[PDB]
Swiss-Prot record, chains A, B, C, D:
Alphabetically ordered keywords of this record: Calcium, Lectin, Manganese, Metal-binding, Signal
Shown chain mapped onto the complete sequence: 24 to 255 of 273
Protein name: Galactose-binding lectin
Organism whose genome encodes this protein: Arachis hypogaea (Peanut)
Other comments on record: Binds one manganese (or another transition metal) ion and one calcium ion. The metal ions are essential for the saccharide-binding and cell-agglutinating activities.
Effect on the protein upon substituting K162I: In minor form
Length: 232, 232, 232, 232
């Protein structure tokens, strides 16, 4: 079996293992800050630099994966706490969309909300143009920020949030468990055919965005990942 | 929302949070040993002492949960390494079945392999009477040790195994990720309607068993759990 | 180490984690209402359902704990605002005293004011028979509602009160901080040997009572708790 | 009664409510970073800018207080995780000791470990020169980093730690409860006469330090405080 495994307890500016895109910075405490608080339509993304083989064209086999990460979103004086973080999977050549308006696109899609990715968004602003639910929510996205499915959630300013994600290749099920500050767990699951929506090799990472009036602190604190593809 | 959350880094005799059933002992290192290596058809089970409300007849709501645990199975001289461990959910009055033959029943079912439980088995012996697959496997069980679904797995003697389980109430999906010593992940997922198969109040725990010729060390090293039931 | 931890932001009927005794009800907003406004000598108590091992006869070790809760007492028309709430610790078999007169007993003691418990009382009526100070007070109680120590306090009708309690096992000190509506803090501390006054396994909870002409709304709004006992 | 109350969910370097001393910086996420990772013998301290009257020479009354704060200590590559954070109380003219060697002094004492302060240290290095216990520990300090009392503790890299402190003026008891990431609570309490050891007016704050080969990230995330002094 072919396995990709890594663990980040902290991050650093001169680490070849991470690809930094856009407005992302690494703070002295080791956290990744995805957006720039002084820029209009700010977009920042981080990717694990090595492409992951999620499916084999020779065997037709699809990888399963287990990943856990922690983040924090914090309000900043005078701006609307927006727009949120998305944990995404995309083709290995993925870049911030050209002429990105940031905001509700979460840095992964065009103005119409379309892109080439699979993701789990932690959305803190209700965009009517992308049929967002009225409150903060966790969503399962397939090539669109108009989520396939959402669940109500609450983004608590300054709270450390823990997420665990399981992709079971046989049932094609993406399962997500989000552990909040008040101790409650929020879950969401959806069948997503990764072999049909994504290429053979992909990149995994995080993206966040803001607008002129919607800005907040978006931090990635830690990330562990294991994927296993059967080679028989 | 109603949340039940606990974490065991170690275990102790006299800990009122754990109900011990059958041949269970607590080792000096804090590990739980489920079976007795010198007894024929040995059965040992540990339960979280408090009943957990997994669903409500008033709202029709069903809880989601996130649980992680670690175990170890180790071979002993001359006996067949058998029979394995099951992580199970059962009615609050659950007891080792009367006249239990241990063995392939894993301490949760009768001789015909029927019982009242939902579980995830780490099965190290192929019982033809229970239509077991030919190799070691992880299975999802619904009122029977004749699993609804299985996935091939390998039980490595002396290896610490990590398991993460997500139950998403909306899709009724039970997703399991098993992390082995060699770093590879094994996953299995199945739609199980806990509201249809179990009572409103249940107990969560572990069970293991052996036979005359089939015995091995079955250890529970740690267990964390969080369940959340929306109250409306 | 052996740790018991929980957090209630709200409460619900049928939550197997809480034992309801006497006249307790759960309101639609999630608050616990301890007494029944239409009953003479009303007594209601809520206990965390799982016993807590506060000390071990094997090692001689005693647990430390940290707990925070919020309550509200509100006046009702025609009756005297009485008698108050007590946060208490008692043997695991604890029940409302048989033939309880409620009133100044706070539902934890007999007519003479004696019982088997350790508690922190928020007393709103001056019972001369229990040597109460002349005004509202917070008291530390050891097997009696004739407090070992009191501090003057003011119970404001309809005000949400926040309490934090620390029990340091090494010094045997029970420290209490009460945050009033006017913003001021009230504190009280007393050395109490829980190993000498209580059994190894105990229950934690709240109790309130009224009399014929002494009745008021007694609400428990939230409760968080953590206890840790060092093990061999 | 005379009450001082404040709450910081975040901090800003351009706010007059806080005094910054030495190598302290405010990160974009709003956290306070006390030490500079690239400097030898780095010392940084933060103080609430308004002096708080803890006792009266006219009445002889002493204030009680309740304070809660959260911090994080994180390891950095190639340097020892040292030296720790101290929550301290000191005269209103308090400054980093002249020619401070940082390290085991925690930025509050001289080379011999003596200073004018009362504090609660979260010490991560065993300095034999200050009779430190062999492991990580929480200590209660009275004019010396040779603690009056200590309790074993474990500093987990990247973990958010919650602390609650109660000072009861009647018993002169300083009680501390520390909530760890593994769920366990650690407590320590000591009788400290603030009238005898400190002036009528004091400043409250935090300090941290490093050495040549002993450096780590020291962060202050939040701080709430309430003190009340009886004026009758
Ligand atoms: C209508 O213009 C008129 O006034 C303009 C003055 N103006 C207004 C604004 C602020 N409004 C806006 O930015 C509008 C766009 C908007 O609401 N985005 C959303 O902002 C969110 C946070 O609130 C989230 O981030 C969402 O994701 C994101 O979609 N900035 N400047 C003039 O310049 C213009 O000449 C004139 O004609
Ligand atoms: C066959 O009888 C004849 O010889 C007997 C002598 N014998 C044989 C045995 C051992 N066989 C057995 O125990 C048979 C049952 C068996 O295979 N269980 C499975 O053992 C596994 C480990 O290999 C797993 O644990 C499975 O889950 C479990 O089902 N023990 N004693 C006489 O006593 C009897 O008078 C006589 O007529
Ligand atoms: C004068 O007597 C004759 O007429 C009486 C008629 N009466 C009077 C009352 C009300 N007084 C009482 O209830 C007296 C007891 C009392 O003062 N409790 C305290 O009430 C507090 C609230 O004010 C707090 O709750 C304290 O904790 C609680 O101890 N109810 N009925 C008869 O009852 C009696 O048989 C008969 O001989
Ligand atoms: C033998 O000496 C000769 O070579 C030295 C060269 N040297 C050695 C070192 C490293 N040792 C040291 O730094 C020694 C001091 C020390 O152990 N502090 C503690 O370090 C901790 C982290 O491990 C914590 O921070 C504690 O709080 C802090 O007290 N750095 N430089 C010269 O400098 C010296 O002139 C010369 O004669
Ligand atoms: Ca949105
Ligand atoms: Ca089997
Ligand atoms: Ca009274
Ligand atoms: Ca030290
Ligand atoms: Mn959305
Ligand atoms: Mn099986
Ligand atoms: Mn009283
Ligand atoms: Mn020390």
């Amino acid at each position: 079996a072919e396995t990709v495994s890594f663990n980040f307890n902290s991050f650093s500016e001169g680490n070849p293992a991470i690809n930094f895109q856009g407005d992302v910075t690494v703070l002295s405490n080791g956290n990744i800050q995805l957006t720039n608080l002084n820029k209009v339509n700010s977009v920042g993304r981080v990717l694990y630099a090595m492409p992951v083989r999620i499916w084999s064209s020779a065997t037709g086999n699809v990888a399963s994966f287990l990943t856990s990460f922690s983040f924090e979103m914090k309000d900043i004086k005078d701006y609307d706490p927006a727009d949120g973080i998305i944990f995404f999977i995309a083709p290995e050549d993925t870049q911030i969309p050209a002429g990105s308006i940031g905001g509700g696109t979460l840095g992964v899609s065009d103005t119409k909300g379309a892109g080439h990715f699979v993701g789990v968004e932690f959305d803190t602003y209700s965009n009517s143009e992308y049929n967002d639910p009225p409150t903060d929510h966790v969503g399962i996205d397939v090539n669109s920020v108009d989520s396939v499915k959402t669940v109500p959630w609450n983004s608590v300013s300054g709270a450390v949030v823990k997420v665990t994600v399981i992709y079971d290749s046989s049932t094609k099920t993406l399962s997500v468990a989000v552990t909040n500050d008040n101790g409650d767990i929020t879950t969401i699951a959806q069948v997503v055919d990764l072999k049909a929506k994504l290429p053979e090799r992909v990149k995994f990472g995080f993206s966040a965005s803001g607008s002129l009036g919607g800005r907040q602190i978006h931090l990635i604190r830690s990330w562990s990942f294991t994927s296993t593809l059967i080679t028989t």
